[PDB]
Design a protein around this ligand. Sequence first.
Ligand SMILES: OC[C@H]1O[C@H](O[C@H]2[C@H](O)[C@@H](O)[C@@H](O[C@H]3[C@H](O)[C@@H](O)[C@@H](O[C@H]4[C@H](O)[C@@H](O)[C@@H](O)O[C@@H]4CO)O[C@@H]3CO)O[C@@H]2CO)[C@H](O)[C@@H](O)[C@@H]1O
Ligand code: CA
Ligand code: CA
Length: 418
Amino acid sequence: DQAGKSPNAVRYHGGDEIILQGFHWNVVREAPNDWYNILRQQAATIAADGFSAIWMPVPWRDFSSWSDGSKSGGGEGYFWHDFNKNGRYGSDAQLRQAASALGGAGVKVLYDVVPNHMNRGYPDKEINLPAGQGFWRNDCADPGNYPNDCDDGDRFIGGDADLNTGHPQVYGMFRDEFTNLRSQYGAGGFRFNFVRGYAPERVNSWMTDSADNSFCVGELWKGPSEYPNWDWRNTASWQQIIKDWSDRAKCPVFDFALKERMQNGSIADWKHGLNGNPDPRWREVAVTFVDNHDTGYSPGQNGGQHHWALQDGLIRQAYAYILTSPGTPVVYWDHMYDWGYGDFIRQLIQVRRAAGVRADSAISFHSGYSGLVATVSGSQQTLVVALNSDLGNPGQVASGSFSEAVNASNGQVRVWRS
Ligand SMILES: OC[C@H]1O[C@H](O[C@H]2[C@H](O)[C@@H](O)[C@@H](O[C@H]3[C@H](O)[C@@H](O)[C@@H](O[C@H]4[C@H](O)[C@@H](O)[C@@H](O)O[C@@H]4CO)O[C@@H]3CO)O[C@@H]2CO)[C@H](O)[C@@H](O)[C@@H]1O
Ligand SMILES: [Ca+2]
Ligand SMILES: [Ca+2]
């Protein structure tokens, strides 16, 4: 496991990670207080499957609850009240055991952290920040969903639970928790939630202070149309928006550019995500995914959130693409362990590793065939990927001797190695 910073000092940890998203939306409902036991028991399996890191749920206890019609939720971690680890996923003791098992098996543990807001109204919590001291966004005049003097980012819905992450004392509080997670809970890095809610630069500061050499990823989900009309971003590509955040936070960013193309474009257009960018400084910072707990379905209740879910007919194609291309891929718990795509994903992980494909590997797209046809220059081997294509043989598009590595869904998914 190579472990440096990119040529632009972005914390991609060598550019060779393969991450497993360690949970789905309904875990606290389906395996109440048992999740960490489940991960401890699966640790060896996860490690054997080929994952170098696991994205853990928010460790901070969440006893929130909400409901609007048919839809209900809470306790998943995004509306935590204090840093106590005895939450709905399991106890502090179980977390430590879980993190120890994962780490023991060579899997780095990445924690999901929510610095933007907290469950302000929770009657029994260990963290109580009073009003009138500048700890909250609403300690200042709050016009709309725009930075105010108490919060240099967007607000979460109403903004009444938004923290002034820039307040010396709030910053310091998060800083200390990140260091704790690293020193007693075996953190190898963090997944930053709702990155639109506070300054990119603050993420860099936090990383510098607590885990400079760790892996980090930011969740920036905000389209061009969400920026003000006078902002350059209102007319920029999804790629430029996430790339800009990454340059400032010095952390890799979720490829929402690729996700938007998977949802709205044709398969041939998948070449427009950040990870397909001809400049390695651009594609190496992309953190690719097919679905997550927000965008995809989850076993259980209401099918989870499914805010921007990939149709089942493209799941295999979607995984074939992210596992064989540049950037850093993320595999969704469910596709891997619930829905039966596990064997298929296992195969591709092996292909990725044997070819020596990494964050900055070169990718070329071929224009003369239907579907998506790409040539990937791994450090060990060259890959020819043809998805929903009429391509006849790898030799039509690449020089060399190729063997078939993957052939699934009636040739809709084909991968060849040199
Ligand atoms: O006190 C502040 C606000 O509190 C109340 O908000 C409720 C929401 O109405 C609920 O829908 C819910 O919010 C969830 C949200 O549904 C869920 O997607 C998740 O959101 C994450 C998401 O994973 C991710 O995309 C990311 O970008 O950030 C989001 C925020 O972390 O988690 C949310 C929190 O559980 O629950 C909240 C709070 O209970 C109230 O209705 C508001 O008016 C009020 O302003
Ligand atoms: Ca690494
Ligand atoms: Ca905010």
